[PDB]
C-alpha cells in the first residue's frame, strides 16, 4: 500500500455510517408554551414534501399551546407489545373416515401464512427474527375432551417424514416430540430462531435456484428455503385406529422480536398460502367511499 | 412433597400470557444477527411517517382507484368556495384508512396526541393561489361557508417555492385518550372536521392548465400514542386462504 490513492482509500470501510441515533422515548413528548409569532423569513408551517421526509412542524409553531406534561407511555407500541400474543397459525384435522388425514396421522408444513390475522400482522415488516411459543389445543370437532394420546413431532428439513401412523420416524430418537393427552391442558413449547439466515423474510424477490425459469417452474418464485423450518407431524399413539375424530389448533406467540424494513400493509384479500396473489377483478379501495368530497 | 394449592386459572390457556415454556432444542444457538438497515423498535416510529390520505374517496371502480389519491383545485368565482372536507378521526372509516397511521390505529383501541396533514400542491410553477385549511373541534357542525370555518383552528396556505403546507390538528380532547369514533354513541370520540376552502382564488396565466391537484399526506406528531391493542377490523377475510 504505497500509492497515495490506496493510502487515502475508503475501500473496506465496514463501519455503518448512520446519520440517526435512537433516543429513549418512554412517554409522549411534552408540550411547551408558545405565543404568537409575527416575523419574516422563517416559516415552520411551510414544508417541501418533494424531499421525501415527514413534516417537522409542531403544535408550538402553528398554534398557541400550553405546557402539557405528557406521561402517556409508549411501552404498548413496542414489537413485543404487538407480537407477543398467541394467534391461530395452524389447524390439522384427523377425521375417523374422510379424505384429508384418514389414517390417524397428519403432516403440516410449518407456515404461518394460512390465516389472515397473523399473516397481515407479521407481513407489516419484511424481515423478522424471533423465538416462538407454540401452543397446541386438541379436541373433537364438536369440542369435546376425550381420553386420547397424541404424539407431536417436529421434523426439520431432511429428516424422515412419517408415511403412516406406525412408521419408524415416530421412534423420535432425535426429533423433538411431545406426548400429550386431550384431557391434559393444551401443549405448549418454545422454539428458537432456526433459520439459516439472520431473520425470517416473509417476502423473497427471487428464485431459490439457478437455471432457466420457464413457465412450469414459476411456483418457486418467492420460495425462500430459509423460512422452511420443516414439518409438524401429529399422530394418534396406537397401532389401531383412534375412536374419535380430532382437530389440533396451533397458536404461535412470538417473543424476543426484532423487525426490519416496514412495508405497506395488505389491503386485498389473501388468496393462497405464501403468495401475494390477489383477485384482479375484485380490487377494492383501502377504505370506505362517499358520494362527494364536500359532504362527509 | 412440598405442600401447594393450585388456584383458579389453572390449566387455562391465555393467548396474552407472558410465561416460560419448555424449549425443544437444548444447547441450540441461533444464527448470529448481522446488521440489517431499517430496524423497528416501536410502532410509533411508523406512525410519524406521512402516508397518502385519500380525501377523494369518491371513486370505487378498479379502473379509477388512482384518482382517489389526490383532489382537484381549479379557478373559482372568488366567493370562498369549499374545496374539500373530511373527518379528522384517524381510526375511523374514511380517508384515513389509506394511511399507515390509520391501519396501525385499527390494531389499537385508544389513541392520543396531535395529528398532522401535509398538503402538497402539484400544479404548474406559474399557477398561484391561497387556500384556507381549517380544523373544527368536536361539536361544531360542518361549516357552511368560509366565514364559519375561519372560527376554528386554521392555516392560510400560499402556493410558492415551497409546494407543501402542514395543518397540525392539535390534541383538543376532553379525555386523555380517544377511542376510535364511529356512528352512534362513539361519535362522542369524534376528533372534528377538516375543511379546505379557497382563500383568494386559483390563478394561472395563458398557456398553463386551468386545474391542478392537491395530495394529502397524514402522519402523527411526537406526542402521539396508542393503547389497548386489539384485532383490526379495517379488512376482514373471506374465502379462507388456500
Amino acid at each position, epitope marked *: 500500500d504505497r500509492v497515495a490513492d490506496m493510502i487515502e482509500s475508503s475501500i473496506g470501510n465496514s463501519v455503518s455510517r448512520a446519520l440517526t441515533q435512537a433516543l429513549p422515548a418512554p412517554t409522549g413528548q411534552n408540550t411547551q408554551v408558545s405565543s404568537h409569532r409575527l416575523d419574516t423569513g422563517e416559516v415552520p408551517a411551510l414544508q417541501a414534501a418533494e424531499i421525501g421526509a415527514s413534516s417537522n412542524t409542531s403544535d408550538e409553531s402553528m398554534i398557541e399551546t400550553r405546557c402539557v406534561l405528557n406521561s402517556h407511555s409508549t411501552a404498548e407500541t413496542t414489537l413485543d407489545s404487538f407480537f407477543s400474543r398467541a394467534g391461530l397459525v395452524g389447524e390439522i384435522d384427523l377425521p375417523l373416515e374422510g379424505t384429508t388425514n384418514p389414517n390417524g396421522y397428519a403432516n403440516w408444513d410449518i407456515d404461518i401464512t394460512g390465516y389472515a390475522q397473523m399473516r397481515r400482522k407479521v407481513e407489516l415488516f419484511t424481515y423478522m427474527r424471533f423465538d416462538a411459543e407454540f401452543t397446541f389445543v386438541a379436541c373433537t370437532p364438536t369440542g369435546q375432551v376425550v381420553p386420547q394420546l397424541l404424539q407431536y413431532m417436529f421434523v426439520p428439513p431432511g429428516a424422515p417424514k412419517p408415511e403412516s401412523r406406525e412408521s419408524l420416524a415416530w421412534q423420535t430418537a432425535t426429533n423433538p416430540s411431545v406426548f400429550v393427552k386431550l384431557t391434559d391442558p393444551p401443549a405448549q413449547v418454545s422454539v428458537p430462531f432456526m433459520s439459516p439466515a439472520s431473520a425470517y423474510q416473509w417476502f423473497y424477490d427471487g428464485y431459490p435456484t439457478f437455471g432457466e425459469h420457464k413457465q412450469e417452474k414459476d411456483l418457486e418464485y418467492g420460495a425462500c428455503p430459509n423460512n422452511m423450518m420443516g414439518t409438524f407431524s401429529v399422530r394418534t399413539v396406537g397401532s389401531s385406529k383412534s375412536k374419535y375424530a380430532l382437530v389440533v389448533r396451533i397458536y404461535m406467540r412470538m417473543k424476543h422480536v426484532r423487525a426490519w424494513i416496514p412495508r405497506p400493509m395488505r389491503n386485498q384479500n389473501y388468496l393462497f398460502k405464501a403468495n401475494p396473489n390477489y383477485a384482479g377483478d375484485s380490487i377494492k379501495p383501502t377504505g370506505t367511499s362517499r358520494n362527494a368530497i364536500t359532504t362527509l | 412433597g412440598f405442600p401447594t394449592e393450585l388456584k383458579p386459572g389453572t390449566n387455562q390457556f391465555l393467548t396474552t400470557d407472558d410465561g416460560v415454556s419448555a424449549p425443544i432444542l437444548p444447547n441450540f444457538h441461533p444464527t448470529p444477527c448481522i446488521h440489517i438497515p431499517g430496524e423497528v423498535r416501536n410502532l410509533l416510529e411508523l406512525c410519524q411517517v406521512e402516508t397518502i390520505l385519500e380525501v377523494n374517496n369518491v371513486p370505487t371502480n378498479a379502473t379509477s382507484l388512482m384518482e382517489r389519491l389526490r383532489f382537484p383545485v381549479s*379557478a373559482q368565482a372568488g*366567493k370562498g368556495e369549499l374545496c374539500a372536507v373530511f373527518r379528522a378521526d384517524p381510526g375511523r372509516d374514511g380517508p384515513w384508512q389509506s394511511t399507515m397511521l390509520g391501519q396501525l390505529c385499527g390494531y389499537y383501541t385508544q389513541w392520543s396526541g396531535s395529528l398532522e396533514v401535509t398538503f402538497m400542491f402539484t400544479g404548474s410553477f406559474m399557477a398561484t393561489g391561497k387556500m384556507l385549511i381549517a380544523y373544527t373541534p368536536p361539536g361544531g357542525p360542518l361549516p357552511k361557508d368560509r366565514a364559519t370555518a375561519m372560527l376554528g383552528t386554521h392555516v392560510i396556505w400560499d402556493f410558492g417555492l415551497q409546494s407543501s403546507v402542514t395543518l397540525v390538528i392539535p390534541w383538543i380532547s376532553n379525555t386523555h385518550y380517544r377511542a376510535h369514533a364511529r356512528d352512534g354513541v362513539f361519535d362522542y370520540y369524534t376528533t372534528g372536521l377538516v375543511s379546505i376552502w379557497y382563500q383568494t382564488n386559483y390563478v394561472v396565466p395563458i398557456g398553463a392548465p386551468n386545474t391542478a391537484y392537491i395530495i394529502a399526506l397524514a402522519a402523527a406528531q411526537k406526542n402521539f400514542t396508542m393503547k389497548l391493542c386489539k384485532d383490526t377490523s379495517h379488512i376482514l377475510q373471506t374465502a379462507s386462504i388456500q
Partner: antibody
Amino acid sequence: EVQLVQSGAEVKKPGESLKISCKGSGYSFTSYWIGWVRQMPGKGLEWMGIIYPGDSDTRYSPSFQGQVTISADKSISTAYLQWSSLKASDTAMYYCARLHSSSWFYGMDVWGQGTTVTVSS
Amino acid sequence: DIQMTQSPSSLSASVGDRVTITCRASQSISSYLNWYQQKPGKAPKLLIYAASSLQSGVPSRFSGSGSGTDFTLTISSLQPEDFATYYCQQSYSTPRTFGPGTKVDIKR
C-alpha cells in the same frame, strides 16, 4: 336528488309585472350560482344572468339588464326572475339552472323543468 | 362581448357515423367552452365542460377538444339518441354567450 322546480306555465298581458320563481332542492343554496336562460320559440338558448344567492351577487347580460331583475331568497332557497313591465317580445321558455359544483366556469350542470311565459293581448 | 359561432349550422348522419362540430369564439376563452345537448321539447343537458371534461353520466362516445378560439365536439359513433341540437357556450366572460346551435338529423 339535486333538482330545480319552476313555477309553471304563465300567461300574462303586455305591461303587467311577473315574477317567475325556481326552488332548488337536494343541495345547499348559498353556495352555487343559478342564473337564467331564455329560449324564444323556434330559437336557441340565450344567457340572461347569474345570481349567487348567499350574499346576493347578480351578473346581468347587457341585452337583459334594465328589463328583468334576478334575485334570490336564500331562506326558502328560491331564485326569482322578476319583471317590471312585460313586453310582447317576452314570450319564451325560461330555464333556471345551477352552475357546476366544481367551478362556476364549468357551465350550467343542473337544469330545471322550464317555465313557458306567454304575454299577449 | 364574446360572439360564439358554430359550424355546420346543421349536419346529417346515420347510426354509427362519426359526427364533428366546431365552435369558434371571437375572443380567446382559454378552455371554458361548455357543450350542451338539447332534444326537442326538453331542457338543455350539459355534455362537456372545460372543452374536454366529460360530464358524469355521459357516454364515452362524446369528446371535446380545442382551446383559445377554436373548439370541437366529436361523437365517435352516432346513436339514435345523439340526434339533437348541440350548443356551445363560453364561460370565460360575462355575458356567457351561447352558440347559435348545431342540429344533427338522420340522413336519407
